[PDB]
Structure formats: C-alpha cells, structure tokens
Design a protein around this ligand. Structure first.
Ligand SMILES: *[C@@H]1O[C@H](CO)[C@@H](O)[C@H](O)[C@H]1NC(C)=O
Ligand SMILES: *[C@@H]1O[C@H](CO)[C@@H](O)[C@H](O)[C@H]1NC(C)=O
Lengths: 423, 134
C-alpha cells in the first residue's frame, strides 16, 4: 500500500493478477487521467526515473463489475538533472553552454570534422568561439547521470534532406538555428524569414570565418530566448548564392510522444531473423527500456521519425514490453510473439482418479487428439491466452476416458508442422 | 574604378586569432612603413593603412622561408580584399617610419576592428586616392 521512492529510481510496479475475460481498466493518476490498454490483466504501471513530480495517489479500476485499487507513492537528497540550454556570449561573438543541474556539470563540445556525422576532439571549455560546420554537440556530466543536448545546424552547402525537416521546442527553452554556408567568394549572405517576412531584431547574429585557399564560410544564427505559441511556424533560411533550405518549428507547452502502433501479434517461424520495432517520434529525449519477464535492455533512438528495434528475441516467445518514459510524458507498448515449433506430446500426468489427463505442449498451433482409433474423449482444453503468471510451460490437455484398455496411455498431437505421441 | 562599397563583409571575425598566431610564431622581427602623415580620418584612413599593410604582407611572403610562408599567407588572405578596389599609387607627399612586423600586425588588426562595421554601409569610391595631412 505504501511506496518509498528514493531519487530518480527506475523500478516496475505493473504486477499481474489473474483476471481473464471481458475486463478493461483505466489509470487514475494524481488528480489527472491516464489512458492505458492492458492485456487480459496487466496495465502500464512501471517507471523509469520517477521525477520529483511523478509521485502520489495512483488508482486503477475495472469497468464493464467495478472494483477500485489504491497505491500511495511517497518520496531530501537534492538531486537534479536538466538538459543544457544554449546561450550567446555577452558582448562577444561566441556561444557558451550552461546546464541547470546540482552540482555544476562538466560540459564538453563536439564537432565531427569528417564527411559524415567516438571520433573528433572534445574541448571542455563552455565558452566556444570556434564553431563552424560539423555536428555541434553539448553534453553535461553531473552527479545524477548524464543529460545531453544537441545544437541544430542546417548546412546549406549540402544536398537537401527532402523529408520535411522539423524541430519541436519546449515552451520557455530557447530556440537556435544556424546555417553552415560555404562560398568560394566573400560576396555571399544568409537571411532568416518565417513566411517571406524578415527575422526579429533580437535574432540577427553574424560570424563569418575565413578558411582554405581564398575562401569564406559564413554562419547566420537565429536566436529566440523566450519561446511561445507566437513563434510556432515554418522557418526558412535563403542565401545570396545558395539554394533555399528550410525547416518547420513547432511548440509544445508540456511535451509530446507519438507512435504509429503495430498489430501486436506475430506468427514467426524458426530462425528467420525477425525483429520487433517501434516508430516513435517524441520530444524531449525518450528514455526507453524493454522488459521481458525481468529483462532490462535499453534502446537506441527515412528522417521523418526515429525508430528503434529489439532483436534480442533468440527464440524466446511471450509478451514483450516496450516502455518509453520521457521527462514529462509516458508511453508503453506490449507485443506478442509465438514460436512456430509445433509440437511433441510427452507431458502426460499419471492421475489415478477416474482418468489420467494427458497434455500436449508447445505453442501457438497445438492440437491434442488421440493402434486403432478410439471413440469418446474427455476435455478439449480451449482457453484464452494471457491469464496471469504462475507455473512454467502451458499445455492443451485432452484425455479423460473410462474404457478398460489397460496399458496404452493417450496423447497424440496433430498440427500443421506435423505429429508426435506419448507412451 | 568601382563604387568600393563591398556586397558582403570582407572583414572576418577570426582575424584577431590569426594575427596573434602569426605574432607568437614569428622567429624573427622582420623590418617593415607605418604611414606617419595619412589624412586624419579613422574610417577613410583605415582602408589606406590596410592597403599599405597588404603590400607588406605580400612582400613578406617573398622573403620568409618555407616554414613561415603558410603563416604569412594566412594573414595576407584576410586583408587581400583591398586588391579588389582600384586604389591609386601612393602620392610623393606620403611619409612613413620603419618599424617591426609585430607592430605592423597589431596595427593591421586595429584598423580591421575600426573598418569592419562600416565597410558595407558607406560608399568609399572617393577613398581610392591616398591623401596626406602633415
Ligand atoms: C584552390 O582554389 C581553387 C579555386 O577555388 C580550387 O579549385 C582548389 O580546389 C582550391 N584548393 C584546395 C586545396 O581546396
Ligand atoms: C507576437 O509577437 C509580436 C511581436 O513581438 C507581438 O506584437 C504580438 O502581440 C505577439 N503575440 C502574442 C500572442 O504574444
């Protein structure tokens, strides 16, 4: 009944109780609603890094019968971790990075000098003056882990993405957009426009650096310190001697996690590689973890979204869980995969009381139906899947006769893959 | 003879680092003649001082050894833009004093700081002829 949460801890609280049938539940969080879809039944109640806000009264009831449950999540150590915010130097042409966390974290800079995006030297100095082209990255290392940040730069001196580039920002967190332009001659200028209208006065920032044989490389930054639903629009950046590259910018007052959602049912055969992937587009950094009967495996993030797959199946069927709890929103997605090994009947139970139950196992296509053929049979199994955890292995029992045959013993499995029988 | 108003800024933001790097790696303090009587104007005179400095930078490329050629040319490329305007030959009235390459480099950087915010705003066609004022 009483839960004690120490710091940003990652533990599971989505226990399963035997409830199969026409049962549907709905999560009732601390003075707020929570949409869920269980498998009957167990619903999304596990947590990865329980934030100082994420604690309190959490209820859950069934709606068809109506019985409600109650859990009290309680929490001192002053642990804080927040993504770094970019900033422009005070009366100087340089960019300094700052991070709001306890204690002051070590911030380093990265710039992939090679043609593509472990490599390239990190200059941990915070105030960065040398910043032209490449993938600009800024990460922090505090006592509560590691919170990364990425400075977006759209290089005009490259082929277009052609996939509608976008960048969602948090209401209040500053908005930054730079243009890594490369022109042989010095006569080249970049301009910022929202919808064919000039950029705000408090946004213009020029930093033209000269590189290689008589060649210049200019960068036009777009700075907006306080962002709001006023600057939610597609921003373009055209140049004097370079094509017009553009990127849409949307705002969210809290956050957003969106995912396509799959059929959640697979008839995978032996080997054949097979993978369970999720198409999720989300802001901010999606903290993901896959769960499978106590397993903990973290996941990695053409360009319209960032998908991630879980190829650690290794012929282990069952219900695979995929949680993704961001720093504001929560999401969970379970999928069911069964093995195509259809099956040898051998797990017979020698019951002496009236008739011995002979059961055949494995999964999903399994049928138990027993020299010559004998008429009149007992049970025929028939039961719904996902009905609480308990004992290992599941079989389809189909033997309960009263005829006096003597030594014979039933159990003869028949399926699409083949046949087998017990003693 | 062009309007001399530059389309986009010819003065880069990293000129100070480039000048300090040449100042710290110079093995010898080469003899250089800065001007002592150019007509009194910081903006108008800035271009004139850079034209004289650019000639010295080109001259230094022809006398510095193999190892120093790259560093000298790096400075030359930052101030080569003055060669795009039809600046006329220095008048016979022009006077100058002998100094060292370190001082010339520092003076050059100072002129670029002063000229940078005005190079694309005003028409400097009337500056093609260097003027004196004793
Ligand atoms: C030198 O400049 C010319 C003209 O822009 C160019 O073709 C050449 O590739 C440049 N050299 C290098 C090493 O980039
Ligand atoms: C949006 O910004 C403009 C410019 O500052 C301002 O005039 C306008 O009132 C703002 N609108 C809202 C809804 O804040």
């Amino acid at each position: 009944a009483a839960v004690e949460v120490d710091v940003s801890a990652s533990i599971t609280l989505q226990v399963l109780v035997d409830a199969p049938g026409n049962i549907s539940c709905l999560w009732v969080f601390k003075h707020s609603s929570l949409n869920c879809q269980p498998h009957f039944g167990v619903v999304s109640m596990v947590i990865l890094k329980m934030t100082e806000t994420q604690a309190g009264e959490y209820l859950l009831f069934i709606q068809s019968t109506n019985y409600t449950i109650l859990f009290t999540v309680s929490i001192t150590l002053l642990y804080t971790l927040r993504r770094p915010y970019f900033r422009k130097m005070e009366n100087q042409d340089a960019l300094v990075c700052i991070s709001e966390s306890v204690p002051e974290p070590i911030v380093e800079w990265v710039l992939c000098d090679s043609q593509g995006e472990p490599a390239v030297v990190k200059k941990e100095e915070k105030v960065l003056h040398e910043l032209f082209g490449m993938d600009i990255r800024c990460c922090a290392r505090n006592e509560l882990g590691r919170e990364c940040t990425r400075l977006f730069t759209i290089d005009l001196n490259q082929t277009p993405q052609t996939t509608l580039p976008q960048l969602f920002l948090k209401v209040g967190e500053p908005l930054w957009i730079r243009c890594k332009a490369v022109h042989v001659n010095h006569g080249f200028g970049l301009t910022w426009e929202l919808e064919n209208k000039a950029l705000e006065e408090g946004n213009y920032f020029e930093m033209s650096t000269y590189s290689t044989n008589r060649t210049m490389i200019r960068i036009l930054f777009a700075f907006v310190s306080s962002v709001a639903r006023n600057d939610t629009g597609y921003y373009t950046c055209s140049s004097s001697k370079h094509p017009s590259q553009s990127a849409l910018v949307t705002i969210v007052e809290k956050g957003f996690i969106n995912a396509t959602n799959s059929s959640e049912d697979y008839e995978i055969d032996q080997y054949e590689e097979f993978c369970f992937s999720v198409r999720f587009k989300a802001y901010p950094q999606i903290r993901c973890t896959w769960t499978f009967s106590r397993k903990s495996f973290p996941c990695e993030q053409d360009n319209g979204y960032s998908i991630s797959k879980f190829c650690n199946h290794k012929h282990q069927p069952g219900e695979y869980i995929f949680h993704a709890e961001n720093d504001d929103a929560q999401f969970t997605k379970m999928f069911t995969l069964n093995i195509r090994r259809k099956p040898q009947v051998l797990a017979e139970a020698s019951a002496s009381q009236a008739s011995c139950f002979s059961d055949g196992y494995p999964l999903p296509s399994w049928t138990w139906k027993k020299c010559t053929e004998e008429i009149t049979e007992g049970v025929w199994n028939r039961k719904a899947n996902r009905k609480v955890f308990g004992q290992w292995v599941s079989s389809s029992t189909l033997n309960m006769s009263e005829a006096i045959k003597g030594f014979l013993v039933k159990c003869c499995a028949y399926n699409s893959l083949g046949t087998s029988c017990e003693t | 003879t062009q309007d001399c108003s530059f389309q986009h800024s010819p003065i880069s933001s990293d000129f100070a680092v480039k000048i300090r790097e040449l100042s710290d790696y110079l093995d010898q303090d080469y003899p250089v003649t800065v001007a002592s009587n150019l007509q009194d104007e910081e903006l108008c005179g800035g271009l004139w001082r850079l034209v004289l400095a650019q000639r010295w930078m080109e001259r230094l490329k022809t006398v510095a050894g193999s190892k120093m050629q790259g560093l000298l040319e790096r400075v030359n490329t930052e101030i080569h833009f003055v060669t795009k305007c039809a600046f006329q030959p220095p008048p016979s009235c022009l006077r100058f004093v002998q100094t060292n390459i370190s001082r010339l480099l520092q003076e050059t950087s100072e002129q670029l700081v002063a000229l940078k915010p005005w190079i694309t705003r005003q028409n400097f066609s009337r500056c093609l002829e260097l003027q004196c004022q004793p």
